[PDB]
Design a protein around this ligand. Structure first.
Ligand code: FAD
Length: 449
């Protein structure tokens, strides 16, 4: 148990009651350092470990697709924690008021949470800390190398992050010890009432018939294991050569599970490393799941304004500002962008895939966010438009990967300066003709009418 994984947010009188794990990011029972450390703290005090998960007033900003995925996995997680003699409690309200009241009504001895770098979690922590006196710990249960330990500053490129992370990989890439067992209404009720509130906001194709297709990704820890095994056995060999072809789904499709913490990324990394495949495909996949995923936490953790023009690199701010007054080829409102009402059939196909499946191909994720920059009055409104559609419609959205990916596409964050254009300046450019050379755009457009 590496102590560099756990940080202290409040040092108080170490309480005399159950250690409470505040699940936020990692919604799984296996391979969870926050769950394995809380048990270790529990055993050192002879008190049973418990889990509390808060259902917040911020789900109504997303849709049914995200609400169902999370709650269905929780129903499976609740059963799993029961079989390990850990009781799971679910509260519906403000985490600051709900958690503070809970630790008092149950005589919590120690409080543990998993690590999110997002602004909304720092908001919740501010409230809880001001109303509790027991010690408050957090564990990075989502990154292979803990976010604060990998780097002490914000990195400007991946070629600088890849040595700093791989030099610490032997310290932190290791097997999970098992979760030894211990010595506010039903979830189905909450799913029922939540669906009703969100229902008249459901995305609808034309009229009546809804747009989302929930049969693409089953939620839960067990489904994620089947996904990862199917990727390694069937899709890992050709990852490095086919990841950039949207006509073929040769990606791991792990992001909906990764975002909700329904499978630990290190569990993925251990099995990839031990498996024989195309060595280049292994090299390409490991870079995405270790370098680019864990640098996204670094961007969000070390930039308080990660979702604004303020966090862009200086060369990109200077270039974009010099082109704010250029004429734009087209301008679309958010409502037009949502429905896929653009003059680009490649963009409209990309939007239609997101609406239908809640997951959009990683390659077109760059084209789709750069045309938003090309068709917006200012880069600021483009950042808002890109954030709005991503968080609303992506299964894996509302994630540090999303903001880092969007900041990469719009402001060149973790990228370099390129040849100047109008409107977009030095930012990397992706043309309609360029995508035709790399993959058969005809099938992708037809597949999503
Ligand atoms: C503008 C934009 C927005 C994005 N929004 C999100 C998002 O909200 N949530 C999200 O999880 N990913 C986002 N992605 C990152 C990336 O596209 C997805 O991780 C990936 O496409 C998800 O599908 P996959 O699991 O089949 O990827 P795979 O090719 O199978 O890679 C596996 C994992 O590596 C990680 N990864 C892969 N590519 C990237 C990347 N470019 N940056 C960071 N991590 C990466 C992902 O965690 C991914 O799950 C975004 C990318 C861009 C360019």
């Amino acid at each position: 148990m590496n102590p560099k994984r756990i940080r202290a947010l409040k040092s108080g009188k170490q309480g005399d009651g159950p250690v409470v794990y505040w699940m936020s990011r990692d919604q799984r029972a296996e391979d969870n350092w926050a769950l394995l450390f809380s048990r270790a703290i529990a055993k050192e005090a002879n008190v049973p470990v418990v889990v509390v998960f808060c259902l917040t007033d911020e789900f109504l900003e997303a849709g049914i697709r995200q609400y169902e995925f999370m709650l269905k996995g929780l129903q499976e997680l609740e059963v799993s924690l029961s079989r390990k003699k850990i009781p799971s409690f679910f509260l519906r309200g403000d985490p600051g008021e709900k958690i503070s009241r809970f630790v008092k009504d149950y005589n919590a001895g120690t409080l543990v949470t998993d690590f999110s770098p997002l602004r909304i979690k720092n908001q919740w922590i501010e409230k809880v800390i001001s109303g509790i006196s027991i010690p408050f710990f957090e564990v990075d249960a989502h990154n292979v190398v803990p976010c604060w330990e990998a780097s002490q500053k914000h990195e400007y490129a991946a070629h600088t992050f890849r040595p700093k992370l791989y030099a610490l990989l032997p310290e932190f890439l290791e097997e999970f010890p098992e979760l030894e067992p211990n010595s506010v209404e039903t979830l189905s009720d909450v799913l029922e009432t939540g669906v009703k509130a969100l229902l008249p906001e459901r995305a609808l194709l034309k009229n009546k018939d809804p747009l989302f297709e929930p049969w693409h990704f089953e939620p839960g820890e067990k489904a994620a294991k089947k996904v990862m095994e199917s990727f390694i056995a069937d899709r890992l060999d050709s990852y490095g050569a086919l990841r950039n072809d949207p006509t073929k789904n040769m990606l791991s499709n792990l992001s909906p599970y990764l975002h909700f913490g329904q499978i630990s990324s290190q569990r993925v990394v251990l099995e990839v490393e031990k498996a024989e495949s195309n060595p280049g495909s292994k090299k390409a996949f490991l870079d995405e799941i270790l370098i680019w995923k864990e640098i996204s936490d670094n961007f969000c953790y070390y930039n308080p304004g990660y979702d604004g023009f303020e966090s862009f690199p200086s060369w990109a701010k200077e270039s974009l500002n010099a082109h704010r007054n250029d004429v734009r080829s087209h301008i679309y409102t958010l409502e037009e962008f949502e429905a896929g009402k653009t003059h680009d059939p490649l963009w409209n196909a990309s939007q239609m895939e997101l609406l239908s499946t809640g997951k959009m191909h990683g390659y077109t994720r760059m084209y789709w966010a750069k045309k938003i920059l090309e068709w917006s009055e200012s880069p600021e409104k483009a950042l808002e438009i890109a954030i709005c559609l991503n968080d609303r419609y992506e299964l894996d959205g509302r994630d540090p990967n999303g903001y880092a990916g969007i900041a990469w596409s719009i402001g060149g964050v973790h990228d370099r300066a390129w040849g100047e254009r109008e409107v977009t300046g030095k930012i990397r450019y992706m043309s309609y003709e360029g995508c035709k050379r790399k993959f058969d755009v005809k099938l992708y457009i037809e597949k999503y009418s």
